[PDB]
Write a protein that binds this ligand. Structure first.
Ligand SMILES: CC(=O)N[C@@H]1[C@@H](O)[C@H](O)[C@@H](CO[C@@H]2O[C@@H](C)[C@@H](O)[C@@H](O)[C@@H]2O)O[C@H]1NC(=O)C[C@H](N)C(=O)O
Length: 294
């Protein structure tokens, strides 16, 4: 209720009230910003990470791996400080593929070396932590390497580090995945990719994790419509009937969830089927923040 009804960017009094909101108890909002859709990357893009709503908790930098040096420069020099001004945390996402890369020794030294290399994606940009995207099962050697890397990262990020920086586990699999069973003690938040998913399933998936976390570490994710993308149908009209809305309102039985996240937050409000790039006032984000913290 200290959050703008449009996407205004507070400056003084209006700002401090948003900072103090974020310092206190709330269901948090996170969003994956597709780096290749930032105005500072290539051309033709309409949305910039500077547009992101003041009442957002975490912004994920999600590169595809071809983004121009302009974007990274902009991120370091411009976007991170501005987003830090609004009390918005900025977190680099990387695929689990990076943590099981066989170019890196499957040894203690190898795990540290790989962690150090991944920590440069955080430190070199003044980021608030690292998000590992886990969407695949692992063999015994891949598991051993990924676990080692998590344990090394845990010295600088997440609940074991004492730095206040985040180590985030984002996945479309459940809490029986061996990697989760090995690294759950290192994890700040666990974000469940729940695009197109039955509301009837949310408790079942949550139950798989609940013994390893508090409810406040758990987030569920819906997708915005990606240009030429999968039709998850998470953002159908009317809004207050959408899967996204149902996610904001959903609570595990007996407890309160940590919040929700959007994939492709740069596509906030673009209709399902509209494959053009457009600007956004982040209506859906700000509305869903309000629907969680009334
Ligand atoms: C091969 C492929 O397209 N994989 C994508 C993957 O790259 C996406 O990030 C992923 C995100 O969604 C999550 O995983 C799936 C498996 C479900 O469990 C979702 O509910 C999760 O949020 O999705 C993959 N794409 C698909 O699964 C699309 C699917 N084949 C379809 O056409 O409906």
């Amino acid at each position: 209720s200290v959050c703008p009804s449009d996407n205004t960017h507070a400056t003084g009094a209006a700002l401090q009230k948003i900072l103090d909101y974020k310092k206190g108890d709330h269901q948090i909002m996170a969003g994956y910003f597709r780096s290749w859709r930032d105005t500072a990357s290539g051309t033709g893009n309409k949305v910039s990470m500077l547009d992101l709503p003041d009442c957002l908790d975490i912004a994920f930098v999600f590169p595809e791996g071809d983004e121009t040096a302009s974007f990274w420069t902009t991120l370091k020099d411009t976007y991170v400080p501005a987003l830090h001004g609004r009390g918005i945390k900025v977190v680099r996402s990387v695929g689990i593929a990076q943590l099981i890369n066989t170019a890196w020794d499957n040894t203690p030294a190898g795990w540290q070396g790989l962690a150090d290399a991944l920590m440069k994606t955080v430190d070199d940009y003044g980021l608030d932590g690292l998000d590992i995207n886990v969407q695949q099962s692992l063999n015994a050697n891949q598991l051993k390497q990924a676990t080692g890397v998590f344990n090394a990262l845990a010295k600088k990020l997440g609940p074991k580090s004492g730095t206040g920086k985040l180590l985030i586990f984002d996945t479309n699999m459940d809490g029986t995945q061996p990697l989760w069973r090995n690294v759950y003690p290192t994890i700040s938040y666990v974000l469940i990719q729940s695009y197109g998913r039955s509301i009837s399933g949310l408790q079942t998936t949550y139950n798989s994790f609940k013994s390893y976390i508090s409810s406040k570490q758990y987030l569920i994710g819906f997708s915005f419509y990606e240009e030429n993308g999968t039709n998850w149908g998470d953002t159908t009209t009317p809004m207050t009937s959408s899967r996204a809305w149902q996610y904001a309102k959903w609570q595990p039985s007996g407890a309160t969830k940590g919040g929700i996240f959007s994939y492709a937050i740069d596509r906030d409000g673009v209709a399902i089927g509209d494959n053009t790039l457009k600007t956004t006032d982040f209506t859906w984000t700000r509305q869903l923040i309000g629907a969680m913290n009334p």
